[PDB]
Symmetry: D2
Subunit: 123 residues, 4 copies
């Protein structure tokens, strides 16, 4: 079923929970896990690589499976999921931008609206 799982990580507490869920799902399904962190339109790259290092720490994936991407997060996630033929995307319901006002974060709404596979939302 799930041979390749993609974790979208933003370093938020929701995303740290998602990382634990993604690691467990990969272990249960005998799947390859890829973690991605997008940085938006250097210092930005430094901070971003730090966030991605934490996702790699929490999930244990190899270096070629931890990717820094650029752009609107959801667009970057979807591109990587298509490129890596992900069978599941795991991401938080909300992130760093949460105010409790949206029903689901804007990047998770975008991914759920265009996802090429199931999406596991972690609160």
């Amino acid at each position: 079923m799930f041979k390749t799982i993609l974790l979208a990580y933003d370093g938020s507490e929701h995303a740290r929970r998602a990382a634990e869920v993604a690691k467990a799902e990969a272990e249960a399904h005998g799947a390859r896990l890829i973690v991605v962190h997008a940085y938006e339109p250097r210092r930005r790259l430094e901070r971003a690589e730090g966030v991605l290092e934490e996702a790699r720490a929490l999930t244990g994936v190899p270096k070629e499976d931890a990717l820094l991407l650029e752009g609107v997060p959801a667009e970057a996630i979807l591109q990587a999921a298509r490129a890596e033929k992900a069978d599941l995307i795991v991401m938080g319901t909300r992130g760093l931008g949460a105010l409790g006002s949206l029903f689901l974060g804007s990047q998770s709404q975008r991914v759920v609206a265009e996802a090429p596979c199931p999406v596991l939302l972690v609160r």
Copy 2:
């Protein structure tokens, strides 16, 4: 992690895909799977029990684990998930009411907004 999984089933093609995902997740995690179908505010009960029989067929769960509920679907799902201490809710992104116009069905939006655990959305 996932010791109890709840599948919300409406008999839609999205929900039949979700049933396959839910069965696989239960097998992978060694989890107890519960399937629920809500009927809205008899003939209604007959049709509803038929839909639930199909969810039971597709997942193989025992009778006490296939439940007919009443009410706004999402409210019924959430009540059952709390009562059964579900660790994962699996449901389709859309259902019988799909027009392609919503970003996610209204029952899946409600469940994601108030879920007591992660939600796996199956397209």
Copy 3:
């Protein structure tokens, strides 16, 4: 600008507020106001005509401007708005189905996603 306004009415308290806003907007803009109420897939027709009579009471529109429609509410609203060349749709943020759980009701989400003109959301 706004020569034709369409009010979507479901008889909810939000829709009664919307009716007052729609009447005021029509008066301010010198616009023709149409009110519509959709009934879903007789007794159903009786109840529906009652709800529409109340919208007509609250807005003062003539009979040919108060319409009963059938179908998924949002689809019916959008069809009428295109047919009547509405320049503004006025409707509540929520309705009879409100649980406080959605960010906006499912019929208002559908109309905002496909509207042929601006939409005035009344809380």
Copy 4:
């Protein structure tokens, strides 16, 4: 009804349409119109004041009625709407960040979810 209208402007084509609608609504209702532009967490201030100058150009409001705010746009808009006792908020359905993937932009979703008054969404 509408004695004070607030226009949320981001300089997008949707927001230029919204500015025209807001100006017409203020003229029709004999209302005071306030325009606001939020800049996010200098050059940023320069660009932001330029965007706000365009909103002032398009609507004709006086200087004390054209405001630069800081923060998550929707939070800034809502704060200003409460402070100015707005009776209507006018804003686009989408903005500079549009990919066509969301049902409504994330700032418009936030404002509609917490608005202290009706919200007129301009496509």
